[PDB]
């Protein structure tokens, strides 16, 4: 199958995601609607259930709404069973219409539908070449109060109907009991509750094994991807172990929700996206887009900086899920604003690197403040809006033009209000021009592109006041006027002679696992795949065609490898770096080091005898470790994903910048559990 196939669960870069807030999309089955105080058919009380369900989605898939838009993937509310409690938050009734208050990760939310309904959804979607992504929030169960168990459902957790435990009398310690987070520190945000939500304790073997078993059920149900909620609030080490569980079973494209504010650039965020085993929702991208196109708080130079910076900060920038708004921020379109702002932001996003996601209703110019005013029922299913047609014209390009899906990004023309950027992949090119200035046209002269000589029609057909482009030799464009609020797209595709890797996924797995290598110019006959210097050919290459390769990871030592391929003739491709071969199945282990005193600015890290521990290289050490919540300084702790059943040697380090102080004495030793969790407690050796 080709890289663009709906069967490709490892690569969403050629897709366009449509984010669906299930309850607010389409009530296809009134029979499953909640009743009484938990319900409002009119959807006037946005904190109640409105009736939107999976049948509705199926209907909207079958009637051409999504497909007509060029949508090729959907991201839906967390499908798992939520609490049925109607929570009164100071005079206002609230329901789990949003799906984020889980009670049983192995059952469905009856308001959305049954397991049978879910299967029907998967089938209907797939039949229409639409991939299905589910929100998954293993961070917590639901709102709770230990002192008052009668509040809500006391964050109770069930296992396919079997009560595991609740927030009150949590003898098992399934949850954390460290109060609520104040978002002051990462550690604080991880080991304390989000709001009043019962924080799951992933160091608890039951919880760990349960959640990993739960996701398997959904993977078995045929999901094509996962949107991990509140990833900044779960141990990064545990999440890597979760991603390993997924990847070592049935790998599916996964991205986490890690909020970033205006002008916020987080190295931690980058590191997470770079080493966790999942990508992220591109908040950096979205916030900048809003500043430039919506709020006018930065100009095209800021947009360009974000593009160049992000391309350098993210190992796999093409896996980042972009967007212009969502269920947690005001809707992009301000009721009083000019619609061209939203249309341009849309066009920009659809043609930019990464994986574009469109919040349901954006195409209908929905306006709304913060939660829940931004979660109103989609008021129309009209295909006649300008925004609908924009998506309709550009979405398909991600499929037909690999430059848009995998291409680099380069600024070709720029001023305060104008940005003309180029996407390039192999023999494929796309040039996009955007003039944010709604009042002033710009004179474009001196534009140089990689487009071959010729005349290029605006892919938008002038919908956004675009124009035709005339390119001479050397890729020089004839002078032209970029209309006020003008947005244009010119593109060119052609066969690529040299094997060119555009994408690889998953990016972290143990040997034997099958990975997907997408691009162009691979040729029809099997070639060779390289994991570092190790060459793989023949049988272990399950399938090989021009745009996609399926190959099993060879049994090489755990570590980070550069992936490369060569066609049957021996011609090598570019290198796709950062591939992590695990040392085997993973388990999440908590490392605790006692009496490790330090100086302000200097932190304790963990290093060990396996790649998961950085193989004794302090530059690849795990940390910095935590010392505030679960354990207090001078005791440090951290949750780490390590190879199950392996006997591992380790030591702790103190680091100040790049300067490192090693523990004295002999290495510590322990053997990782074969499944579940473990806590290794040792003293700092001077
Ligand atoms: O020994 C003393 C005492 O200890 C214990 O009590 C402590 C609690 O254990 C502890 O959790 C802590 O809770 C307090 C919070 O720290 C504090 O913030 C406050 O919480 C308020 C909150 O401040 C309010 O804003 C309000 O929250 C609203 C949100 O503002 C809304 O936006 C909305 O939200 C929900 C969204 O609608 C959902 O979509 C979803 O969000 C998801 C995102 O959409 C998604 O993108 C992302 O991926 O994931 C998100 C999460 O899944 O969920 C959101 C959260 O539900 O709705 C909420 C809720 O109305 O209300 C809360 C609660 O009033 O107050 C908390 C209570 O004090 O501090 C306690 C005291 O120290 C014991 O429990 C107790 O018995 C003991 O007496
Ligand atoms: O934003 C969160 C913080 O995260 C990082 O802070 C780290 C420090 O870099 C570590 O050095 C360590 O801090 C220890 C400190 O090393 C230790 O000496 C002790 O600090 C005393 C200190 O001796 C005394 O002079 C006075 O300042 O009181 C301090 C508090 O007792 O204890 C510290 C831990 O409490 O750990 C923290 C993480 O907790 C980051 O570098 C910081 O910017 C940031 O604040
Ligand atoms: O592959 C080569 C070798 O790899 C393995 O060695 C590991 C060790 O097992 C780790 O302990 C670590 O070594 C640290 C050491 O723990 C630390 O004390 C420090 O050693 C200093 C020492 O304190 C000081 O007294 C003096 O002797 O200098 C030493 C440094 O040379 O620093 C060590 C790291 O530099 O890391 C190494 C790998 O680097 C394996 O055990 C070996 O068999 C193998 O040869
Ligand atoms: O080798 C020629 C020339 O190439 C490169 O310049 C290009 C700029 O990088 C690119 O921004 C664009 O420049 C336009 C400005 O963006 C715009 O504001 C206005 O000033 O017109 C410019 C074009 O006339 O195009 C040029 C190429 O024409 C390279 O950066 C230069 O060093 C080099 O001289
Ligand atoms: Ca319904
Ligand atoms: Ca947590
Ligand atoms: Ca890379």
Curated annotation (Swiss-Prot):
The active site is at 229 (nucleophile), 257 (proton donor). The lineage of its organism: Bacteria, Bacillati, Bacillota, Bacilli, Bacillales. The record marks 328 as: Transition state stabilizer. Residues 499-580 form the IPT/TIG domain. This is Cyclomaltodextrin glucanotransferase. Its main location: secreted. Ca(2+) 1 binds at residues 27, 29, 32-33, 51, 53. It catalyses: Cyclizes part of a (1->4)-alpha-D-glucan chain by formation of a (1->4)-alpha-D-glucosidic bond. Ca(2+) 3 binds at residues 315, 577. Substrate binds at residues 100-101, 140, 145-147, 193-196, 227, 232-233, 327, 371, 375. Residues 407-495 are annotated as: C. Ca(2+) 2 binds at residues 139, 190, 199, 233. Pfam families: Alpha-amylase, Alpha-amylase_C, CBM_20, TIG. One of its GO terms (cellular component) is extracellular region. Monomer. Its cofactor is Ca(2+). Keywords: Calcium, Disulfide bond, Glycosyltransferase, Metal-binding, Secreted, Signal, Transferase. Its EC number is 2.4.1.19.
């Amino acid at each position: 199958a080709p890289d663009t196939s709906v069967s490709n669960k490892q690569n969403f870069s050629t897709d366009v995601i449509y984010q669906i807030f299930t309850d607010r999309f389409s009530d296809g089955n009134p029979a499953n609607n909640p009743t009484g105080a938990a319900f409002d058919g009119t959807c006037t009380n946005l904190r109640l259930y409105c009736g939107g369900d999976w049948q509705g989605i199926i209907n909207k898939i079958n009637d051409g709404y999504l497909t007509g838009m060029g949508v090729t993937a959907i991201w839906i509310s967390q499908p798992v069973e939520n609490i049925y409690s109607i929570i009164n938050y100071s005079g206002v009734n609230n329901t789990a219409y949003h799906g984020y208050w889980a009670r049983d990760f192995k059952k469905t939310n009856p308001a959305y539908g049954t397991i049978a309904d879910f299967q029907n959804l998967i089938a209907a979607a797939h039949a229409k070449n639409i991939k299905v992504i589910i929100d998954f929030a293993p961070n917590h169960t639901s709102p709770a109060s230990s002192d008052q168990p009668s509040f809500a459902e006391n964050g109770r957790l069930y296992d396919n109907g079997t009560l595991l435990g609740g927030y009150t009398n949590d003898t098992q310690n399934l949850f954390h009991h460290n109060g609520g987070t104040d978002f002051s520190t990462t550690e604080n945000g991880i080991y304390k509750n989000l709001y009043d939500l019962a924080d799951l304790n992933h160091n608890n073997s039951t919880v760990d094994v349960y959640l990993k078993d739960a996701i398997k059920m959904w993977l078995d149900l045929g999901i094509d991807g996962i949107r991990m909620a509140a990833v900044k609030h779960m141990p990064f080490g545990w999440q890597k172990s979760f991603m390993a569980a997924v990847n070592n079973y049935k790998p599916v494209f996964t991205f986490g929700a890690w909020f970033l504010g205006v002008n916020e650039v987080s190295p931690e965020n980058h590191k997470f996206a770079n080493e966790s085993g999942m990508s992220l929702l591109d908040f950096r991208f979205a916030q900048k887009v809003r500043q430039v196109f919506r709020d006018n708080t930065d100009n095209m130079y800021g947009l360009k900086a974000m593009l160049e910076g992000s391309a350098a900060d993210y190992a796999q920038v093409d896996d980042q899920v972009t967007f212009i708004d969502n269920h947690d921020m005001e809707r992009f379109h301000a009721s009083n604003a000019n619609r061209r702002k939203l249309e341009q932001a849309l066009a920009f996003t659809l043609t930019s690197r990464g994986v574009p996601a469109i919040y349901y209703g954006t195409e209908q110019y929905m306006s709304g403040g913060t939660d829940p005013d931004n979660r109103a029922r989609i008021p129309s299913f009209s295909t006649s809006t300008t925004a609908y047609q924009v998506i309709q014209k550009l979405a398909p390009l991600r499929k037909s033009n690999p430059a848009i899906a995998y291409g680099s990004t380069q600024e070709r023309w720029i001023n305060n209000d104008v940005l003309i950027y180029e996407r390039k992949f192999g023999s494929n090119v796309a040039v996009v021009a955007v003039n944010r200035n709604l009042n002033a046209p710009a004179s474009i002269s001196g534009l140089v592109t990689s487009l071959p000589q010729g005349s290029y029609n605006d892919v938008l057909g002038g919908l956004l006041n675009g124009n035709t482009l005339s390119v001479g030799s050397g890729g020089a464009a004839s002078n032209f006027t970029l209309a006020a609020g003008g947005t244009a797209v010119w593109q060119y595709t052609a066969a690529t002679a040299t094997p060119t890797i555009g994408h690889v996924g998953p990016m972290m797995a143990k040997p034997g696992v099958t990975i997907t290598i997408d691009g162009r110019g691979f040729g029809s006959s099997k070639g060779t795949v390289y994991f570092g210097t190790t060459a793989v050919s023949g049988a272990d290459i399950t399938s090989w065609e021009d745009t996609q390769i399926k190959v099993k990871i060879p049994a090489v030592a755990g570590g980070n490898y550069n992936i490369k391929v060569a066609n049957a003739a021996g011609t090598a491709s570019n290198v796709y770096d950062n591939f992590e071969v695990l040392s085997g199945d993973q388990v999440s282990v908590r490392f605790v080091v006692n009496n490790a005193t330090t100086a302000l600015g200097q932190n304790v890290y963990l290093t060990g005898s396996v790649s998961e521990l950085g193989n004794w290289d302090p530059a690849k050490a795990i940390g910095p470790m935590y010392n505030q919540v679960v354990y207090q300084y001078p005791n440090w702790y951290y949750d780490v994903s390590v190879p199950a059943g392996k006997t591992i040697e380790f030591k702790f380090l103190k680091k100040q910048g790049s300067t490192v102080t090693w523990e004295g004495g002999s290495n510590h030793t322990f053997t990782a559990p074969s499944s579940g969790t473990a806590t290794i407690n040792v003293n700092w050796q001077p």
